[PDB]
């Protein structure tokens, strides 16, 4: 039950795996038994779901024994489980996609506070561990705020997010 | 709930195709001059 993390805008590879090496059938159904992708001979056939124009596959690795699934421009509404059906198994993976950013676009002054907004899928409890070049290793829950935003605090602070022991790095836009 | 003599289907020839016995594109020679016809019988249907 491997679990992977996203960044709400980047790519990801949820790869199945087999051993025959003969370009065999497979599919990628979500948690609602709805098709998304799947080999049909040597062609491709996107499923009638809400991931029409984003789904794709590496059509050159189907012969080696790997059937990845590249989804571009990830969105919050995609966090869910996925199932391979390579030959007879039920190889399953979980995906969790969220975004942590700021609200003040550019207008910021020295001596004010900094606030972060993290949009995790409902029913999730990520941990926000800020890491900064100044050493302010601020630790807290999903929502974290900084009471000091000075000139020395310039640069993108690295508030990583940890969930199930897996850590994903972020960046914060600071304008002063 | 379909209708109420001829159903027309537009068709466009191609010259760059994808092979069906593997993976990879392919190209063919230019098309023929004209007067191309085909009469066919339909028997089955895959869904």
């Amino acid at each position, epitope marked *: 039950k491997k679990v992977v993390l996203g960044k709400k805008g980047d790519t990801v590879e949820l790869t199945c795996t087999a051993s025959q090496k003969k370009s065999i059938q497979f599919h990628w159904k979500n948690s609602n038994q709805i098709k998304i992708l799947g080999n049909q001979g040597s062609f491709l056939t996107k499923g009638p779901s809400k991931l029409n*124009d984003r789904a794709d596959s590496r059509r050159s690795l189907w012969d080696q024994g790997n059937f990845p699934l*590249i989804i*571009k421009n990830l969105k919050i509404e995609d966090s869910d489980t996925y199932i391979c059906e390579v030959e007879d198994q039920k190889e399953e993976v979980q995906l969790l996609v969220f975004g942590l950013t700021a609200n003040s676009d550019t207008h910021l002054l020295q001596g004010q506070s900094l606030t972060l907004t993290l949009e995790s899928p409902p029913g999730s409890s990520p941990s926000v561990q800020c890491r900064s070049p100044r050493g302010k290793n601020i630790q807290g829950g999903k929502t974290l705020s900084v009471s000091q935003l000075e000139l020395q605090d310039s640069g993108t602070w690295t508030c990583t997010v940890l969930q199930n022991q897996k850590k994903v790095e972020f960046k914060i836009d600071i304008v002063v | 709930t379909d209708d109420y003599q001829n159903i027309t289907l537009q068709c466009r020839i191609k*010259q*760059i195709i994808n092979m069906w016995q593997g993976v*990879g*594109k392919a*190209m063919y*020679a*230019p098309p023929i001059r004209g007067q191309i016809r085909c009469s066919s019988n339909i028997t089955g249907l895959l869904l």
Partner: antibody
Amino acid sequence: QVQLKQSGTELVRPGTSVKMSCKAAGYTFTDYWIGWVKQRPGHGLEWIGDFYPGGDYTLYSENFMGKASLTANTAYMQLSSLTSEDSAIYYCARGHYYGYSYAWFAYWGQGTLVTVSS
Amino acid sequence: DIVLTQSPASLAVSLGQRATISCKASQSVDYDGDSYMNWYQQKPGQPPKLLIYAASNLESGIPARFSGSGSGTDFTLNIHPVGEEDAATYYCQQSHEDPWTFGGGTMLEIKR
């Protein structure tokens, strides 16, 4: 049938970064490269870089290092350190992948004008 | 980088006359017997349209008034019957090896 559309004319200051958009049409766009083209009078027309959406691949020429940048059905351009020399017309083409991306492609786009003036 | 030279720089054509434009290449572009030439047409106020490809395989939509021939570093694009709408500039392009280079462009104006 593939059709390419580009945004309106742009007039920008020099030395800044300029954003361009070339929207696709009702075609997959996922297995096709996209070449970006610059045209200036008395020069013919020159290519900047070629960008693949099916993997976000990049192919550059030896004349646009540190100036051009490409991103990914709505592709975009990223030009940095703009100068008067870049006031010109810009186009986006279609293509393919799996080799011979632009070896035998077709179906060009319309174009847009960029004016570098103060 | 290959250097492509299109000739002549200027040319005059009378109506209903065969028109030929030549393209010279510094380095061979051949690979497995193929000619990797692309020919484009350009009219003022409109973008270039792909005219011919491969020098041996024609496009759609464009009439059969067109052809290309040659070998190696010497190619020729040929047009018949020259009409009124063909007053434009023509470009020869190599697709064999990067970087994608260009020629100087050949003008063509109808003579009546």
